[PDB]
Amino acid sequence: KLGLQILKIVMVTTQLVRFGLSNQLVVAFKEDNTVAFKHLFLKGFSGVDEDDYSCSIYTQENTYESIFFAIKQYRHLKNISLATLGYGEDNRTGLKVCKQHYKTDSDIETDCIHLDLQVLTTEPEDWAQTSFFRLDFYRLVQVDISFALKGIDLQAVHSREIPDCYLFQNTITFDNTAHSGKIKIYLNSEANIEECLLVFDVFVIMICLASLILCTRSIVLALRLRGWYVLVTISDLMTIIGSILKMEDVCSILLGTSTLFVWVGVIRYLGYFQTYNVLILTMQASLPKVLRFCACAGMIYLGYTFCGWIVLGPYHFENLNIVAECLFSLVNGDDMFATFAQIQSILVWLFSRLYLYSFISLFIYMVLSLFIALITDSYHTIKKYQQ
Amino acid sequence: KLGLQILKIVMVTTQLVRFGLSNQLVVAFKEDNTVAFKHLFLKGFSGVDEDDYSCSIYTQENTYESIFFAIKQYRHLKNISLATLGYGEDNRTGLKVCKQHYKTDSDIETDCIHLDLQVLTTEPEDWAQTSFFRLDFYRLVQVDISFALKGIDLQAVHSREIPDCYLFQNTITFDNTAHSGKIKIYLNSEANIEECLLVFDVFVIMICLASLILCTRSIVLALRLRGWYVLVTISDLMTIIGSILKMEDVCSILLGTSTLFVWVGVIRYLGYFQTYNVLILTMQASLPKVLRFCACAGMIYLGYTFCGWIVLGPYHFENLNIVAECLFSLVNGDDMFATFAQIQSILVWLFSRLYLYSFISLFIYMVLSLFIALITDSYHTIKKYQQ
Amino acid sequence: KLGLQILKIVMVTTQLVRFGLSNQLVVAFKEDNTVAFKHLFLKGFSGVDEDDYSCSIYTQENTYESIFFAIKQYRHLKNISLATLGYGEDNRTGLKVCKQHYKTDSDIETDCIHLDLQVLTTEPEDWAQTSFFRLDFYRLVQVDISFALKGIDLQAVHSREIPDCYLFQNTITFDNTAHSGKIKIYLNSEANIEECLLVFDVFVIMICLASLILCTRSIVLALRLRGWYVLVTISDLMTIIGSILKMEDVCSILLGTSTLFVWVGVIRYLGYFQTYNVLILTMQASLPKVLRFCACAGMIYLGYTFCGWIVLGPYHFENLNIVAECLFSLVNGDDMFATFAQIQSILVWLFSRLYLYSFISLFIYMVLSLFIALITDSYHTIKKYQQ
Amino acid sequence: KLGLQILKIVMVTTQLVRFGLSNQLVVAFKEDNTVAFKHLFLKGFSGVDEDDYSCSIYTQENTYESIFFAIKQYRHLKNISLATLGYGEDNRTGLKVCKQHYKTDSDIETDCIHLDLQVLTTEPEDWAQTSFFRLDFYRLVQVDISFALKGIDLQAVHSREIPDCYLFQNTITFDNTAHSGKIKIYLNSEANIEECLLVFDVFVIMICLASLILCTRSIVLALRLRGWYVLVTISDLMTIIGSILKMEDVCSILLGTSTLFVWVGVIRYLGYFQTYNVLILTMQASLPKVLRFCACAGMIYLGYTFCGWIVLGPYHFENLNIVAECLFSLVNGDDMFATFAQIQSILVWLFSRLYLYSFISLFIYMVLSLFIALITDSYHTIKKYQQ
């Protein structure tokens, strides 16, 4: 089981490199088109990829300029853009502007008016003078602009075989829900194909099935006689199910974890040399005390995250995941001075100061030193075991 | 006291999550309106949230453009803004421009002229040519523009019950006190409501009172027989007083510290397993030597902060809190290269260099290694105690 | 062999300082001219040195403006620039615009039209209305603008001797290969000279040859009797071959590694004091166990890099090298919060979260503490050896 | 010597806080005026405080616009600025434009034409068409604009006593020495006063003289009987000489180091408690082995800095101080990913990668772990000494 397992290492590594490079190319085309949509249909989109909202409006005239800008850029799409884009399909072409507003109270009704491309390319501003583009900013909820663009890929034609098509369904929104003098703008784009070797994969399937059967022979041998082979069977299952989902993302996660446990199994096969045996036994003998200490430090960590979220929430810290990520950065060095910079509030400032000093001092000293003291004890006991 | 205490954990955690999310929403509305005031009333406010001053003027024409801009945006507030804003109340509407200047010497007198909206709403601009808007930049101290805006929240009406109102009291200032060719601009905004379940909280009060009485029964039992229960009583007091201030911020700090000690008490109840007992006894036995070493390192740290403040103050470092935060970042790795970048001054440069090298080398090596050597000694003595 | 070896230290250090300062000056001139080409020939080049592409176009009108801008700036080069630049040589002056496009399919033919400077300096801009500057953005591959500029250096004339000349061969490209609505712009510049003491280096050659012969006498003495002298002979070879390539970059790498091993040999000659002997024996006795543990941690590290590349590739991570660099930063603390910021995708987000926490916790704790436990064991065994 | 020494602590701390705050205010006025000069006299100075050069010109028209801009802003200084500035004194008012250029070769002659303010305030701009403002960018070396501005401080009049004046001597330069198509712009400003309690300091002098005499009594007592008192006498000398230079910066460095050793002496007086005695004896017993190991690691560090400077110099790294600061950041975690980002060059790229990995791995592991192993050994030997 030397060549059959090294062949697993090499074949699953090649499968993951080819598959990851394929999805790299495809998602590069996806985000290239959505950035090249944000530069066309959003007014004043600077190129600084700002946030999940691409920009935000603070006045009641840039709203009209952005709406009329999106409609005029959609009308002159053929001149303006420089991809291979063209109008698609409500089973019709042209825009569809839905706006939402309160009933003069409680109900959010919507008024959605469709705009065909013959209405736009007649070219008097007749749609621009209708009452539908009169907006009551006292009671506007949102304005959504939606349309459908098809785009041929030609990087596939570049140095490879011909056929590929796409279809984009864009939705430009004007999110005014926190009625607080700020409209955010989104561009939610989709993409899905239409018209206009499995040998390596089944090969990896056969390799992982044979390794699974032979490792279960080893498992039942160890059962009748009486866990790295558990991880080898796990890697078998993850590669086979990842190959099923690759055949008919989740499959990316399956192949990624499978190759991670593949290289951990290589770290097992380094253990024939006895120095790697010393290191592996150090990790195996020290792991549960580390898990218990990580659990206790995690409970103290939760106490600090709830305290920092319900105090320094307004002064930084919005979600608990953001607070947990920032405090895990603060323990590990980075983002340290930025937290002291974002805090000005006199008593709350003093609380923030001794909070951060107590947190950093306590966790770094009495947690990193304790994790060193666990591993040093385990390593010297294993040195005494080999003496 | 298992269910009564785990009910405290979960119940005070739910109280803090609900209360923190409520204040998150309210302060999100507050800062959304003050950013949407800075974008309306400050000329050339780029959206880069620059400092506590939002921008700064370096000439004597952008001053006039910013003042006249603030007045004209206040006049066209109904067209310009896109919240639900409206003019409020000097018991009157309209602006109130107070400017301060030296007596041709010693006295800073002020000249404050009020501007009603009927004066602005005249078709000719006649306020712009009074002598009050002639400024002597030899002797101008500050110019303050103040007004009052009311704004209905409608995110409360969004998917919840209706009633909410506000009243903002803005104060645009032109701070020229360091008479040094630089006017800073502020927008100091306020907010306070006007017109146009306590079951969970009293439930937490009852839980914490019952736990307080029963833990005092445990305290007097330990007294008559002869400190985690001290922290449990502390958590009782902090949740009860936080519930009082929530009933009739400080209450945020009370609830945050209370939940922090709540999860520390959970870390106590992890101690029934003996590995957590080993870790907790390691921390308890090693804490006072760590405190004495932190005190001595803090005195050396104060020596370095006073030296770096009175030397590298001009070349970076303004307040002692800023110097202490930057040096606490420098010990923990972050902001390391930025301090070497901000320093050019030949002998003072050499002093800065060996200052930073001596500081980082001395504290990181002979303090982090000493904190490891304390904890390793304590952990091996406790291992010998359990052997 | 005291003076002959310290003379090697100081002499090769002086050689490297002089040679590195010479190449510093020359490459400073090179990048100064290529930045001053990007500011002249690229439209809207902000001065923010953006990427290997200097800027990118997202519309089909800034393409025409950038092409016509590059041609007009080349025509007015004598007025526009402020170096000593002049037109050079296709064996002719003037531009040469080659554009590439698909055959209406499969073939990428090219159409390359040359533009002499007398054609540019006509009173009408009649080249701007030829059909060659009609572009089909459905099928355009790239547009390349190329020309040749000569430029005299005068910093050489500044405070030194006279003669120096250059010749630049610029190539402005409009890279539209990912046919995805985005043209990137490059400026690929070249430089090569034309017309218009070796005593120190041969001295280093003689020093290193004498030290090489005498250290081989020491080697054959140790052979007939039965490895720092190996590193001294290595430093001899690297300085001699670096002096050969300096006589007739690679020579930069040779001299850099040679001086690195020069100062490592100085660290050897610190070993006459016995404290440095303790430290050097600690490193020598602890090195192979460190190498085996680094190998095992490197295999686990490869598992994490393949997993993070094939999962968090779309959400960050393009090449495997970039993933390895970012994870080596994450272990050492830097770029910690930036990885949590660039991730939003719900299940993939959860996977990213426990991926990063498991990675940081496992490697920092059970690798840094294990490396400390190796060195502490080796140092105490060497302390027992000296007791 | 308890009260006499604690009085030294408190009085020298108050002296340093008052003196540092005084110089903070004065240098705040200095840099406020030089930023408010860069915003007036430099064209397009964005407010991004870019470098020691405030901006840089890449064309031959922004040169003329910046020169003519500086002259016109100097002419309209009274309208443009908003400090209390006024024209000062060549013993005359007005500008003095010196330009330097090559002799058609070798000699850099200069042509310096003075401009009185009456020449500027003529009804035509007849100075703008003299031949002196014709520039040969083939052979221009630099253009320098110089003038003298006086400015009254009024922050001194704000809430304090009256008298203060200043005089600024600005020098706007157009540095074209690397004749490489890039003019840098400087604004070198000066400042010096003209016309228009020592009780605390002599008190600290008396305290430090009395402590110096009494500590020399302790020194001669220890001499006749047979070093913290050495540091106390050092602090005496540094405070006295700093008070001399404060009476009649260097004095900032003297007072900063004196207060640093003051708080180190406080760390000595913490040693009456025996835990601080343990920590202080740990540092004192472990210091020389740490110094020898720091020396050996510094020699290896010099090897890496010379190698990285003569290789990665062109691809990052200009001065050896910059390389040493960046590598000291790389050891301490910070600036880690930025060094991998700034490197693209295939073999040199591979050299950069294994350079950085070998550097970080070798120094962090086999230096930080060795520094921990020194301190742990010293601390356990001192624990055995107290057992």
From Swiss-Prot, chains A, B, C, D:
Tissue localization of expression: Expressed in activated macrophages and microglia (at protein level).
Intramembrane runs of residues: 320-340
Protein name: Mucolipin-2
Membrane topology: Multi-pass membrane protein
Record's subcellular location: Cell membrane; Lysosome membrane; Recycling endosome membrane
UniProt topological domain (Cytoplasmic) ranges: 271-292
Functional note: Nonselective cation channel probably playing a role in the regulation of membrane trafficking events. Acts as a Ca(2+)-permeable cation channel with inwardly rectifying activity. May activate ARF6 and be involved in the trafficking of GPI-anchored cargo proteins to the cell surface via the ARF6-regulated recycling pathway. May play a role in immune processes. In adaptive immunity, TRPML2 and TRPML1 may play redundant roles in the function of the specialized lysosomes of B cells. In the innate immune response, may play a role in the regulation of chemokine secretion and macrophage migration.
Self-association state and partner proteins as the record states: Forms homooligomeric complexes; probably tetrameric. Can heterooligomerize with MCOLN1; heteromeric assemblies have different channel properties as compared to the respective homooligomers and may be tissue-specific. Interacts with TMEM176A.
Motif Selectivity filter in this chain: 332-335
Organism from which the protein derives: Mus musculus (Mouse)
Induction trigger: Up-regulated in microglia cells and macrophages by bacterial lipopolysaccharide (LPS). Up-regulated by infection with M.smegmatis.
Gene Ontology biological process: adaptive immune response; innate immune response; macrophage migration; neutrophil migration; positive regulation of chemokine (C-C motif) ligand 5 production; positive regulation of chemokine (C-X-C motif) ligand 2 production; positive regulation of chemokine production; positive regulation of macrophage inflammatory protein 1 alpha production
Taxon lineage: Eukaryota, Metazoa, Chordata, Craniata, Vertebrata
Phenotype on disruption: No visible phenotype. The secretion of specific cytokines (CCL3, CCL5 and CXCL2) by macrophages exposed to bacterial lipopolysaccharide (LPS) is decreased. Mutant mice display decreased migration of macrophages into the intraperitoneal space after injection with LPS, or after infection with E.coli O78:H11 (strain H10407).
GO MF annotations, alphabetized: calcium channel activity; identical protein binding; iron ion transmembrane transporter activity
